[PDB]
Amino acid sequence: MDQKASYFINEKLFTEVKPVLFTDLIHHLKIGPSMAKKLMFDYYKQTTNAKYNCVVICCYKDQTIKIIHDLSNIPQQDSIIDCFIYAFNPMDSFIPYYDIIDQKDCLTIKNSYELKVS
Amino acid sequence: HMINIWRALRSDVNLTQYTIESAAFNILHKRLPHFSFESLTNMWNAKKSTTELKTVL
């Protein structure tokens, strides 16, 4: 899986200036969220050029999703149940843009009700 | 001594309607709703709600 997701992230981060999310990799390589998070963790290292501002969220025990802004004093250190890089930001401002994504087979949870046309 | 107060207001202030509601709004800066006499006679009838009697009083 390596050398492809890394290349896609590099292109989407530098060839065209646009923040990348893990959902983009779910749409691209049709892989699970855990694999995408592992890919972000792998890409966070072995990078000498710190041209991006990583965005990391915190999943608390009470499902209190919080975006880390200070990166110095995160309250309730022991209450965090999950931590991963939400997105890579080439600048301070995030302002993400959302469009139509054809999620044909990238779903991890599928509703019991199907879609019928005509 | 009896005075036609609307006539006195006409002589004193130069209004355009000389109506009690209009005169009140123009001088005392108070707006007073005006109801038709049919509304008054329908609200003053017996077996009506206390709100209507309070309104007319």
Binding site: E16, V17, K18, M91, D92, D99 | -
Partner: protein, 230 residues
């Protein structure tokens, strides 16, 4: 010529607003992050709420677009209020612009978003600018046109379009390249800094972008305009 002009006007408006906001030309409090400015902006470009400034920006964009055929380079000049020295020059290079009288909105807006994002990335890294000590100007580079000579016929206007044309014709003065830059005193001469940025490359619109920075001086230049160290 219908959809292209609208997209170019939107891009120019976003460019001017971002340049004014990020360079502290006008107070950030007046600027507000918004998407609708009577047109569908590509992103949440901060647009100032000053009616006079809005009218001035709209008139400037319309005047630039009116002579876009003979204009191959549009630049925004940043000059110090105290002394007439150009400290920053941002250029919107219109190399070809694919001028055709004959691409949808998603691709053009995606290219505009990428260009504006690159511009923002360039702008945040720049040092802060002091308040009420900076001004902005508009300098365009043309190939074949003469401005200000249309009033020699004593023409009397009869419609709004002709009045607007005669106003735009006399609203520009002739200048020279590298005019507001320092005159190369020779005692540690300033060396301008060139930075390249990606530009929109849609099928109907081809745009290149780059910026200029003094990044040097020989005293009395960039003094009390960069908020000291930071």
């Amino acid at each position: 010529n219908r959809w292209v002009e609208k997209w170019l006007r939107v891009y120019l408006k976003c460019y001017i607003n971002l340049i004014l906001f990020y360079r502290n030309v006008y107070p950030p409090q007046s600027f507000d992050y918004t998407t609708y400015q009577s047109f569908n902006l590509p992103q949440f470009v901060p647009i100032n709420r000053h009616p006079a400034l809005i009218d001035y920006i709209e008139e400037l964009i319309l005047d630039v677009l009116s002579k876009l055929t003979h204009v191959y380079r549009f630049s925004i000049c940043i000059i110090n209020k105290k002394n007439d020295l150009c400290i920053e020059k941002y250029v919107l290079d219109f190399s070809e612009l694919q001028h055709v009288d004959k691409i949808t909105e998603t691709e053009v807006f995606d290219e505009f978003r990428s260009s504006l994002n690159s511009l923002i990335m360039h702008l945040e890294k720049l040092p802060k600018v002091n308040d009420d000590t900076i001004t902005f100007e508009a300098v365009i580079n043309a190939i074949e046109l003469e401005l200000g000579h249309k009033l020699d016929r004593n023409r009397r206007v009869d419609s709004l379009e002709e009045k607007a044309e005669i106003e735009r014709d006399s609203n520009w003065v002739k200048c020279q390249e590298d005019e507001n830059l320092p005159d190369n005193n020779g005692f540690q001469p300033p060396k301008i800094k060139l930075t390249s940025l990606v530009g929109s490359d849609v099928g109907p619109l081809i745009i290149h972008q780059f910026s200029e920075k003094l990044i040097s001086g020989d005293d009395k230049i960039l003094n009390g305009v960069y908020s000291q160290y930071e």
